[PDB]
Design a protein around this nucleic acid. Structure first.
Ligand SMILES: [K+]
Ligand SMILES: [Mg+2]
Ligand SMILES: [Mg+2]
Ligand SMILES: [Mg+2]
Ligand SMILES: [Mg+2]
Ligand SMILES: [Mg+2]
Ligand SMILES: [Mg+2]
Ligand SMILES: [Mg+2]
Lengths: 176, 136, 84, 48
RNA sequence: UUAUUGGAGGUAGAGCACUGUUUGGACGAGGGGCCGUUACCGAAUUCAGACAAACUCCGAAUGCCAAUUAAUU
RNA sequence: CUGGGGCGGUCGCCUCCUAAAAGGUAACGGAGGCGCUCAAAGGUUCCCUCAGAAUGGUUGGAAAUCAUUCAUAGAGUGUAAAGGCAUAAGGGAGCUUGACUGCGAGACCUACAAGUCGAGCAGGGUCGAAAGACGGACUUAGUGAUCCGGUGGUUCCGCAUG
RNA sequence: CUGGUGACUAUAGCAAGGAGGUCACACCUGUUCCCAUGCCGAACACAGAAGUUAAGCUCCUUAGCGUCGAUGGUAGUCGAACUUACGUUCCGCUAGAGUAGAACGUUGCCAGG
RNA sequence: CGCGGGGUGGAGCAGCCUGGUAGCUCGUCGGGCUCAUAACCCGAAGGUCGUCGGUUCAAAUCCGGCCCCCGCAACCA
RNA sequence: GCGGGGUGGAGCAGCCUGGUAGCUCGUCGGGCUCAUAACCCGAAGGUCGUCGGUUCAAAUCCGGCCCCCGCAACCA
RNA sequence: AAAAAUGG
């Protein structure tokens, strides 16, 4: 819980001083992290979705929820109820461990890494990071990766504004 | 030629024609208007004839508003057929006009030009009319 | 004499009318089991001592006086109350 | 459902109920607990 | 039959809140010919004005069902 | 049947409008459905709430999956329409078979034959901690008299008697 | 006054601004235990009391939205008289829209203060 | 309703009688052939035998259930 | 009045049974010829008559507008 | 002893 200790000690004080919070309960915190992988080619080959689920489970540490089509779309040849994604929600210690790992061990493994988008905030204090290749994560061996596919990592925060969310993530150590 | 782009029902009961004008009894867009004083169906062809007459007299100087619209289809049987065997096919489109409704409005011209234009228009219509101004 | 060919209508169908609606009046005494109201859905709801049949028919469960009552802002119900 | 089905008590053999089933969805002889009036108890009935 | 009281219900009228129909403005989320700015602005929004047997946010007069109900019959 | 007959169309059942605010109400008037489906899409207990839009995000585009916000019903309700249903009748899960047996005060509808609703009682059950709910399905179509014959059951009869 | 739990067609709602905390209600700290997540102690469940009124919640102000809403007049209409006129007249009933205005709830029971 | 028969590579026929082995004629691919073209000759790929079961060391073959097609015959709610 | 049909340039399938546009000829390119034809190899070419509807999805299912074909149009 | 047209 090194990252959590940093948040309790340094980030809390820095952020509260910067934004003039009358109470500590106003200090933003990372509510959850949702790691999603949309596998639309599972329509054509379910083994792709199975491999994606296994890789996501290795990355995150817990079994993913398989997400199914909410509606049928002819162009995609998608029928309602067909499994076309995987999702993991991380909270608490696992969330913090994954976050520090992503900041330190994983993100620098990005090829030609030059920081993460600073404008990728929903407008209400939540940040979505699109990783373009799973090989980034240290838990995956490229030998067993039949196909390389990305992920969406949604950091959901209690910050009301992109400015506060940016300050929180920067203090945590996100490049920008 | 006005007519709805589509309707839910092409075969409709013909509208009630007794009573007074429910609405649109005041000049609201232009300065002058043509007010119906009797009741009639008004066809799209009659609307078009009156519109052309008044606009041609105004010589594009002013602006014209058609306040009525022929929403209602009416049917007619094929020639020389007996009664029964279903309702006939849509023949045309009509607006129901009762006393007091403003049929047309004009603006951007003198009162004299508006009077003459609306006179020419009224002679194309199956109702008696009167020249009206905005009230205040 | 000249006679023209006629077409046909594709219409000309209707189901039997179902005699829906109120079957007893507000303020009327009814015996238990009397149908109060025939309906589709709950246009009126069962109130006190009133049941709702499988086809939504409203009926009295006790002997008593029928009372149609407001139910909230938009709805209504029918109840039966025992007479003294 | 698209075919008629007779449910007979598997203890006394009485044909106590009729029902229906879809033959493609349930090709097998369907079974279920039903009340057997002769035995005055619930017994397993199955399609004849 | 009338008087009084209660109730069911959606017509006439009216209205546009829904489903459709429809006339003038204003403005344009955004892209194209255009350099930023003189089509389409098809969207959406918005102001005002209209139409309806199978529209209704509303809603009569009557008629109808009743009442330990009174008067006349 | 038929705005003469033939020809064409139609014939039973369900929903809406015509229908004149109870109910009913015709025409070869205006519109559509039905001759099924479901072993769960039934019962019960617990839990849940949509469609759509905006903004971020990789393969991913106007729409796939993820996140926040707004969004009161514009979604869904097997299947037409109407009436209902967001205290759900809509959605998920667990357990189940009441899609029971004998019935039935009373009531609707109605020329008859039929058709519809039904508390409650008894037997034996399912779910539920319990109250309680359950005699199919959000409701209303999905059906056809008698005679005759087939099949199963039967403390019924059995042409002198068995 | 606070809370719990009811009744009433939102006159009760929404929105905006402001105030509140040892009681209490929350957020909140955790996952050993009963219980739980199609993944997640988020939720449900349980154990607990370091911190906070930030949010919920409660209270206060208002009339922007929503809700309610006359009187008067008009449409429609039962009946009658006259009438065929896309009618007239008389009587009774009497909208919808709109206007003035009402309104930021009113109350029962119980336990605390 | 009874009795027979049929279902086999992309098409049309054997092999079922009597248990093993999937043959024949067209069709496609490659080669020889020729000035090409056809014809002809030689190499290959092509159905696991309508479907599900059953008896056997062994099933296209034997025995059942089921799905279609054909011939004749039967049919007084 | 009732039926049937409308799909590359032509003729004809595909519809019945929604997810898949086929054949012959014609056209274009390369080849063979002294050249043309024939022939061989390779390619392009139809928003399925036109508007609406149901559907996640329409040549296909449903309803109009148009065009063509066939049959019918009888008794005085 | 298969078939192989034409050329101002
Ligand atoms: K005139
Ligand atoms: Mg009206
Ligand atoms: Mg005649
Ligand atoms: Mg009625
Ligand atoms: Mg007979
Ligand atoms: Mg004997
Ligand atoms: Mg040549
Ligand atoms: Mg020569």
């Amino acid at each position: 819980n090194r990252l959590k200790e940093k948040f309790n000690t340094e980030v809390t004080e820095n952020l509260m001083k910067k934004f003039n919070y009358s109470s500590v309960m106003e200090v933003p915190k990372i509510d959850k992290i949702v790691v999603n992988m949309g596998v639309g080619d599972a329509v054509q080959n379910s083994k792709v979705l199975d491999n994606a689920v296994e890789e996501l489970e290795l990355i995150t540490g817990q079994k993913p929820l398989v997400t199914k089509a909410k509606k049928s779309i002819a162009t995609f040849r998608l029928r309602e109820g067909m499994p076309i994604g995987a999702k993991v929600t991380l909270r608490g210690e696992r969330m913090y461990e994954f976050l520090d790992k992503l900041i330190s061990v994983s993100l620098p493994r990005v090829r030609d890494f030059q920081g993460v988008s600073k404008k990728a905030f929903d407008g209400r204090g939540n940040y979505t990071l699109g990783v373009k290749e799973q090989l980034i994560f240290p838990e995956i061996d490229y030998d067993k990766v039949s196909k390389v596919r990305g992920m969406d990592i949604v950091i959901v925060t209690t910050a009301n504004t992109d400015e506060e969310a940016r300050e929180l993530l920067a203090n945590f150590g996100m490049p920008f | 030629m006005l007519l709805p782009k589509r309707v839910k029902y092409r075969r409709q009961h013909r509208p009630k024609t007794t009573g007074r004008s429910k609405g649109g009894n005041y000049v609201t867009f232009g300065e002058f208007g043509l007010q119906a004083t009797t009741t009639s169906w008004i066809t799209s062809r009659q609307i078009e004839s009156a519109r052309i007459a008044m606009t041609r007299y105004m010589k594009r100087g002013g602006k014209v508003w058609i306040k009525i619209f022929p929403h209602t289809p009416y049917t007619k049987k094929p020639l020389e057929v007996r009664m029964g065997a279903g309702k006939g096919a849509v023949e045309g489109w009509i607006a129901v006009v009762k006393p007091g409704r403003i049929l047309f409005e004009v603006a951007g011209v003198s009162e004299e030009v508006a009077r003459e234009a609306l006179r020419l228009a009224s002679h194309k219509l199956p109702v008696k009319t009167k020249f009206v101004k905005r009230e205040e | 004499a000249s006679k023209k060919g006629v077409s046909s209508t594709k219409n000309g169908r209707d189901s039997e009318s179902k005699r829906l609606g109120a079957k007893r009046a507000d303020g009327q005494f009814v015996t238990g089991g009397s149908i109060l109201y025939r309906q589709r859905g709950t246009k009126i709801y069962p109130g006190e001592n009133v049941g709702r049949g499988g086809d939504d028919t409203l009926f009295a469960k006790i002997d008593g006086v029928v009372k149609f009552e407001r139910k909230g802002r938009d709805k209504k119900q029918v109840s039966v109350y025992a007479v003294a | 459902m698209r075919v008629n089905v007779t449910l007979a008590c598997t203890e006394c053999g009485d044909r106590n109920y009729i029902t229906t089933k879809n033959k493609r969805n349930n090709p097998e002889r369907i079974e279920m607990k039903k009340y057997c009036p002769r035995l005055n108890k619930y017994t397993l009935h199955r399609e004849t």
